[PDB]
């Protein structure tokens, strides 16, 4: 097994970059638009050293024209400024393709706090939201004009320490394409009784809600100044030659008291599971289920737990919950089947409403094979 | 001489990182019961024997109805905290380890999570994060007429941590059942009378002899590690680790008298990882304004943190990011575990300003100790 | 080459046959329970590490009193085989065997006896046999007012039967405990209203919600062999019996459309040796009336018994001597098991005629497969 | 070990009989007779080829001469036709000797159902009980005669296809003796608060019931045809040196919540046993026991279970439950075999003992001739 | 030949007392419950599996109303001892053992101290010494409207004593439970009207069909030996003692007639160390005056202690220091327990003088057998 040795000469190499290289954050392109002409971009990367990842900054402006009703913020509200990413590398590779909600709750476990948030605290001395860096009005009322802030960070490598899934970009011309689609006037705001899942307002005075306008700009992170030795370039290939993804599906067909399993994909492995019960339209904070479980054919469940335990779990990851949004950790032991649905995620649902269905959200490791 | 067991503490570390690397974690439902305090409020449940033993997860919810006329009740200090009063285990070998109070049990929950316990932070996030499923919650006042739904969680270790499996219970032998005892909260101990001692209480009040339990639920999840693995010799296991007991137990101590140095002496034995000190003052629970100061002290009039109680308390912050409840006092000696042999007798110590009548430090200890 | 299992087979065969012949059959009590439903309905039962263990009979008493003031209830299709409405065992490694439903437990009883599991047949006889011991019991009907008692059994299986060991269990590691868990009918399960999903209650009716259980009672048996036989390498033990596992699980799909082919995939490994497909037509269940046809199929378009409801409902009656319940469809293949690597992909198909809201196909497999 | 040898022989020889020669039911003798005048016959088997067994059919008219008083059948009903029977072979050996309604129960556990029953399904083809093979009024009313039929297999061969127990007949002259007591006017019936146990019906005009008369038909069942070869006859001289025989035993001393326990003999291979609690002439559903069990000294029960458990065992057995207080136990597949006299024990802990209270034992067993 | 089990003897002696030296005995509440027997009587203790168990002291109290208007009820001659009905253990591998009446249990606890169970006997001593605790108490009688508070204790024995383990149980079989089940006197049982009779009952006279239980609790505590002894074999045990049941049983018999000799035949295989016969003539429980003498004869026309009444009793005052109730007769075979085997069958005679409509003679017995 010459794996010990490439496994070693890997992280080697990955140390030396760590170390010799200087970071980067650097604007790659800012742009203001109205929603009712356009809500799709495709960003592209500059080509130079290895590529960690990409800070996204959305502002919008929302203009609740309605004569006399207001509307207010869904439960993810500004996390739904941008409907989908999608990530190219130079070599026509996909990574990432997922959610903007996904993404965003995925940057909250891998900070292990609501991602960029303020924490509260009894401090005299006034820290605090004083720079209202992910913010947005919790109604926008009859006539008036709300303005929102969010973030995102679309990861190529997993973290600022481990470069798995770093893109070297300072390779050929081909060109780094990511993709942004964000919310426009037909996904942002929902009519009361209607799904707010994707949406970021809902209220009576929805119909008559409008962006004055969204503007967005990237930041690119990436690493410069590569150490050069022998052969050239000190580069960790194992990291380099792994994809770090985030993907969404949506699975259906639940049933009272019967166990729904989403099976996962062998080849994989899973660091993250997320998985939202879109009941109908309706989210509630775990009424709606018996229990949830991560389960392998013949050998029974891992962590069958009925949904406060279950959250018990996530509470020790990000500090708080994360209504109807369940999360998985399984960083030090991802998920990794080798046969196909070898392992499934279950949830065994108490009341199933019209259309109910599991919107699944993954966090992976897989090599370019 | 001395070198074998600079050996074995290398094998015994090579065969832990064998055993968390191959071994798969499981967290599993063993019990769960309904029942009405006034019947019962003592159980012993009998977990299930596989593998290497981690801890127990417990969730208790309960109903508490106000059936005072006129008056409320409110949470006391530690609430929900109280409502299991005890809490006792022991191994296939009949060995107990941890035996102490649910409220010591929760702070040290607190302590090694570094926060309390299973808490949810409050933020400026838009996303509506926050208290989404009252995992660890209780209302604050229960007036008269109203009933109120508490949620406990209280996490029983054996193993230290995650990583670090001293203490950990080996769980194989066909026949010989461990055993978690769990000494609940009833209506003799869950309210307390205006003037009356909070304590050991979750609601205290001038209704307090109307309120009752409609009932208490609880789920015992056990947390253990399965499929683990064999070499040539068979098992690979950490065998210190394993015959290492990691405990917490509480006591009491009496005899304070104003500005004149109260001592609780360390066993010996022992390592020490934490402890914690409730002044008990008759009754009161003060922050921090009737101590002098606190201190560890080496004998030998030796003081290694004599502080006053907000520096003492300073500590504290810098490791639960907050204040333990008033009249609570926390001390962290994770990195070198007060150790008697290696340092000589040590005592914990509190000099009181003001000593009421009826007065005790009820201490929480929580330590390393050789099964042989 | 491949010539090693074939040698693998005798021997694992011929040490069955020892094991048969000179070990002696046990059947024993391990455990009893009478509790109330409203405290809890959950428990998790070990078992002794004795030998070889076959299988558990597990005895199930009840007493549910109807205090409505004026309506009755009626047994549901399933009625008493919803007494338990899960079952799951763990062997002494930890690996899970058996995990489903008491009614598919009870339904693969049938199957496996030839006829309703432990029913009493009636005949022209004049000698008083018949009905005397009401062994499996439920009064039909439970007046307002009324309280009915009723006796259910389920052989829970390790073994695949008395002759064949396939499947059974080798508990004599000491320290390293068996689990079987029971999860019971409880006062939010066992009673449907009219109008609400029959499938897991045991009655339903206009008095629905003011049934409930005064009590229920349980007592475990274990099947074991004793006094194992000895030779020149120890135990003579059949190696390929014992490291397979024969387990019964169920599932859920949804998903179906009028006239259109519902196909259900058994997945790869595991030897099918029987399916059983309820079909839950949104609460309702029918004879047949909502199904064009069923049928087992290896993909590459090709049936092997597409029949209308009434002749796969014939090929049962050879199995049972009887239907199985309203929207109950079972099929054998215990002589030639599904197994998707000699003969590709296959699925359970259902065709249905009439599709209502919240329609789903409940599975049931009883199923072997290597524990590596 | 040259058993291994004299087995191997003794099946390939039973092999060669049943596949050679050729099977016969036939009548060997029947009659009509008032049991006021007599009830104890000995009927004289046909000595050919090997024997098998007899299948005894009797019928009855009873007539309920009371002026007002109905009587219903008791649980055991026409099985109390015949009282007792045994066989005695042509070396004055005896085989069987037992009451009708143990060698009835027997029957049915063979049989794996009621014996001789017709079941009852669904269907619409007129099958069912067309023909009144084992049959019997349930009651017969005052001035009433009703017409009874039973029948009884009364066994050498174990089975059709294993000859142990079966006898060599074309041998000596010398006879076979098949006794037979039938039921009487003293034994049919039983008065309101009497024992029924023995009885076919019970009721009010008990006292004035009476047999208009008793008819019996013997069938004789063996293989005739007998192949020869070198030496001459071959046979499985184990099946024909060993005794397929049933018996009955009474038993009495138990005491509320204390272990009752019935010793099994050694030298015998037990195949079934039956224990009937004859609570004091009271006859429960299980209601009476604790639990029933059988047990070797030094090495506890093997099968202690309350009694709905031990009748579920039964339902796997014969598809229903025998009549109340009568208990079966199977022992087919392994043999209840001591070696030394009690070393195993039939067990029954009684929750309630009644003045008079006693077990009825039957069983089944398998000994060399010696 | 019958050498093996001399030495099995020795060995098993050897090892008894090793394990007594070794061993540390402990005494351990295993749980504690208040109830009203109105709702439920009959209880399941599952007690834990811990070394080799002795038996259990279970604590009784309860309060009893007397809720007529005008008439008051007193102790029946058993009183208190009739708080418990019947007392069933089974140890791991579901044998039982003892399965009798509280009264029983109670008369046997009684011989084997040598005086009436936990009583506080008289004495002229100025120092106040007496009966401080209530340890078994009960009021003579409940005047109308009034409550009595009552304390009754049991000793189950699984050991014969605290010196001779033959009968202890070892409970070390993980997932294998002991169950003690206890049936509780309730209001059906406890009280007796005039002219009823009055052996089950604690409480007869005029006003009984009004009294009633506010409430009964029990608290069982478990005796057995812990830190088990060690060997080059492993666990050093008397294979014997632990392979031997220690019971107690009783049974009713009845058939009585004037002046003839009433027989009870002792069972074969068990070894009869004490017998108590009650005749319950009818209800009356009569000092002798209805018996002409009593009998323990080897058949074979052989009486080896016929005694009239008074001479019987005499010799049971030698025992207990004190006569059992009225009608309560007792007979001490403990150094040469009755055997049949050895001595042929044996009976125990009584030849009443005077018989009443419904007589019966009551037995229970103290004796040891082998498992196997």
Known sequence: LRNQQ?????????????????????????????????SVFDVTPANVGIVKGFLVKV??????????????????????????????????????????????????????????????????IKYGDVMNVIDAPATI????????????????????????????????????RLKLEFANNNTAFAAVGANPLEAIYQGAGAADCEFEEISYTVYQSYLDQLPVGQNGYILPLIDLSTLYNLENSAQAGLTPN??????????????????????????????????????????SDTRKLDPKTWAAQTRRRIATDFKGVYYCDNRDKPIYTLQYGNV???????????????????????SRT
């Open 141 to 176: 009322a009859a006539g008036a004009t709300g303005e929102l802030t969010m973030y995102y960070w679309v990861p190529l490598a997993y973290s600022e320490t481990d470069l798995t899934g770093a893109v070297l970009a300072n390779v050929p011309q081909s060109k780094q």
């Open 6 to 38: 490439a496994m070693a000469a890997n992280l080697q190499a990955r140390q030396i970059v760590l170390q010799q290289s200087y970071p980067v954050i650097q604007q790659v392109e800012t742009q203001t638009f109205d929603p009712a002409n356009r």
């Open 258 to 299: 019967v166990d729904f399993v989403v099976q996962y994909a062998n080849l994989y492995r899973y660091l993250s599971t997320i998985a939202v019960f879109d009941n109908g339209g309706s989210f509630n904070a775990g009424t709606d289920i018996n229990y949830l479980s991560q389960r392998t054919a013949n050998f």
């Open 59 to 124: 502002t919008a402006a929302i203009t609740n024209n309605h004569a006399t009703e207001a509307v207010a913020l869904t439960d993810f509200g500004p996390a739904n400024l941008v409907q989908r990413v999608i990530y190219y590398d130079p070599d026509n590779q996909r990574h990432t393709e997922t959610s903007g909600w996904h993404l965003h709750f995925v940057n909250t476990a891998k900070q292990g706090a609501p991602f960029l948030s303020s924490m509260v605290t009894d401090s005299p």
């Open 344 to 366: 499934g995620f279950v949830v065994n649902p108490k009341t199933v409403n019209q259309n109910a269905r599991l919107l699944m959200g993954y966090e992976y490791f897989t």
